[PDB]
């Protein structure tokens, strides 16, 4: 009656993650600086459940996962539900890869976040931007997604379509599709992705977004590695207005024995609308990080970063368009731990 | 120190469940049709915890469970708490069955939902209806419930009382009791249930509800089986008003090797108030379903159904009474998977 | 491949806890008495996850925990998130004890709650009180806390600082520190604790709180034991106003074979502001309890208690200051079960 690994039909896994983060804002209001700024803890720990199952009457193996959200993030209250993060059912087969239904990363977002948002570059490059509509969804419910196998060990595809944010609550007809591709060439990976979003309702208009990206990731054999990524966002509104905005992120790393130094910079350039650039609509961030490989399953890290955000713009409804800079410019010093089980 | 099944004092269990569902509404408003309609995913997966414990100083075995809600249902946001579904402590004894305290199905609801709400018949027969007050609570917190053993293998009783919805938040004195009974007669099961609800506050009045039901479930030995159920709902308001409404649900199945075809229809008939029937207060649904028994622990299914809801009524406060048809008539095509561990 | 306790990197633990509680309010409004009063179930069950990990490159052992909240308490809806209760990362070392970052009890609160809030004394002694500002935070996110070893088996320290409630959402600059100390002297424990809270915003003012306490806990060898605790709370407001209020809690127990009888009383005395006592700002509670040790891992209990709260006061903004008595005086009869795994 002695249990083995096979007696279970699930596994519990987790990312235990804690960032002690001190921010210093310069919004231009002293009180707002005190509120937003200060030390907080950013407990991004999470628990999840997942499993496989070989159904007796269907060859492609059944797969599932249910992942909790961040338990106690900064700027937020305690407590997370099961299902807030990647949460899906699906099927896998050697010859065609896998397909997932539910809550997953869009193919684009996955590349935007990794490598291109790390470390701390996300306020600018992840959710930062001044463009109307929806540049791309991130983690998204009501999504079906195909991950191809690595054809010839060189090549692979990520493809997805899904429902919008309003559609997932029966409050609109918004939807999107997108695709991404990955090519291994010697020590390089070349990445490309697209995502289109349709029927996005915003600022008294219906929008269509088209967002494209390419990037490279390289590994020298002496512990040096890097990435750069370029990202081009267009949006078109039901009243005729066009908007274009681009952006870039780059990172440099040196990994030597148990240590990794990392330098990262990312920026959105000025937004254009109907071909007139809008002044001071750009943002950037520089970030420096030292990381220690404290165990095969864990890391300690220290990090400083400096965000200069855009200094405001109006959306097409004659009202301030919220952006990742509405709360103001800020610097941040942080130390942290992450453990994987 | 090699673990056995007995080293644990809990078990993790789960229903992994995904429905890809396309709806097509005919509310009479085009925009409302686009919003509510379209494809969505209905991730009704859930995780739970449960255990038994033989207390050294008390014979009747201790039992408990804590079950999470649906992680990412359709028409809803992601994330569910532990405790949203059946969540209780209790005791069990061979000679008197079991008793549970906490969050359970009312004895009536359990019969309303199974067999009588499946497949897709619930908008009409589960929460559908035009009657005032509370026809019956469904899953309900603050409930004690006795499940009798199967006396003589033929016969058994389900009995419960509990607090109301307002009472569970110290905002009223609402409560209910009810009871259900089950008799095996050859290849049949005969069911009966009652539920009374008292001090229900609604539409500027205090209500009392009394709801009765009977049904049959039958198994031919050639893979043919069926159910029918009749349900009679009365409500009385503190100002004198009487209301009566009845309803019926029936289902037909043919289960042959690894397949099951299913036909289901259910309807609420026109509501009566103070003995005047009100025109067009009825609803119905027809539903067709093919199901494959893809593994002992899983099923795939395809399903189409058509809901015609009532076309509106006023409650006793001179204001639209919300019903399962306020959002409008709709059809639905669906395919799905459910796995049990 | 036969699992042992060591094959896991986590353990699931739980407190399964159910209280059937009848309250009888005397607010002075009959309807309010019916709402708040009545029978309810108080499911304070909770699940948690925790583990240890010896990192290969860092001596002090890594520790973590993630604990869910109460699944279905009384006066509340069903469902709790992971992380609502003690939820942290940390490190431990034989020579310096342990340090935790995240969501923990303040050193004071831990003593306020145990022994001094039990049984049922918390409406008075835990969150009860009329004093402005924040007397002390309780379970608190954004906290670092050091627990010393038991130096010389006699002596130990609990020390902590953390961010405020507004600060944990970037809506203010509120913070606190405090400390507590524990001395074993024959059959006694002597306790002392402090907590200071700063930049608390309330009633149109900024406050500073200082709260001090001492107590004793004693064990006779015949199953008799007791506690008493005194607690002195001061608060100072940005406009000059001073406020002082003190309080005491005591409990008596007799534990004989499988049984424990318990008597507890606690009270807040009248509040003083700028040296004028305010009439009828005090509260008390007496509570009686019989508890049976139904298993090494479980208890049954019955309990009756009587709360007489203060009869109202204004805060410095000329508006009722909410207190644990705003809802009115009430008595409560309760029976309950608690199981530990
Ligand atoms: C420190 C380190 O090494 N961390 C790695 C992780 O960071 C990494 O995963 C990513 O972690 C970042 C860390 O902050 C996390 O950041 C959050 O991102 C979401 C985007 O979904 C933001 O949500 C938006 O924010 C504002 C709220 O004010 C909204 O207005 C905005 O519109 C939101 N988006 C939408 C569509 O509405 C959060 O606010 C943000 N955190 C903040 C502000 O503090 C990423 O989400 C993580 N992404 C992923 C894909 O995992 C992880 C990889 O798994 O690995 C760690 O090592
Ligand atoms: C689907 C299938 O293939 N198999 C079975 C499961 O479905 C079955 O459990 C039942 O599953 C259905 C599936 O949709 C579920 O439906 C939900 O029921 C609740 C009941 O309270 C509804 O709540 C009401 O909804 C409306 C708004 O939508 C409110 O206005 C109304 O007032 C609510 N009730 C209140 C306040 O009291 C949900 O809306 C509804 N889902 C929707 C619309 O998508 C059943 O409740 C499930 N029943 C049970 C007992 O769990 C499962 C059970 O184990 O077994 C499969 O065989
Ligand atoms: C009961 C028993 O036999 N044994 C022990 C447990 O009880 C013990 O933990 C404590 O249990 C009590 C109830 O049994 C619990 O009471 C709740 O405490 C919280 C404090 O966070 C209250 O919160 C306040 O409530 C009101 C809402 O009306 C607010 O207005 C007020 O402002 C709240 N707090 C704040 C910060 O704003 C709850 O309302 C209250 N329950 C009620 C009213 O029913 C204690 O919190 C429990 N102790 C803790 C969390 O440490 C347990 C501890 O491990 O173990 C048993 O020994």
Numbering used by the authors:
A (entry chain A), B (entry chain B), C (entry chain C): 10 to 350
Authors' description from the paper:
The gene encoding for ChiP is found in most marine members of the Vibrionaceae, emphasizing the general importance of this OM diffusion channel for chitin utilization. The addition of micromolar concentrations of chitooligosaccharides such as chitohexaose (GlcNAc6) causes a complete block of ionic current, demonstrating tight binding. Here, we report X-ray crystal structures of VhChiP in the absence and presence of chitooligosaccharides.
Given that the channels of the OM-expressed apo-protein are closed due to the insertion of the N-terminus of a neighboring monomer, it is important to establish whether the incoming substrate from the extracellular space could displace the N-terminus to bind in the pore. To answer these questions we co-crystallized OM-expressed VhChiP with chitotetraose (GlcNAc4). OM-expressed VhChiP in the presence of the GlcNAc4 substrate also crystallizes under the same conditions and in the same space group as the closed apo-protein. Importantly, the oligosaccharide is bound in the channel and has displaced the N-terminus, which is now in the periplasmic space and has the same conformation as that of the in vitro-folded protein. The GlcNAc4 substrate occupies approximately the positions of GlcNAc-2 to GlcNAc-5 of the GlcNAc6 chain, suggesting that the central positions of the binding site provide the most binding energy for chitooligosaccharides (note that the subunits of GlcNAc4 are numbered 2–5 to provide consistency with those of chitohexaose). However, there are differences of up to 5 Å for individual atoms between the two structures, especially at both ends of the substrate (GlcNAc-2 and GlcNAc-5). In most cases, however, this does not dramatically change the interactions between the sugar and the channel. For example, the acetamido carbonyl group GlcNAc-2 interacts in both structures with Asn127 and Arg312 whereas that of GlcNAc-3 interacts with Arg94/148. For compounds of four GlcNAc units or larger, the central binding sites (2–5) are likely to be always occupied, in a manner as observed in our structures.
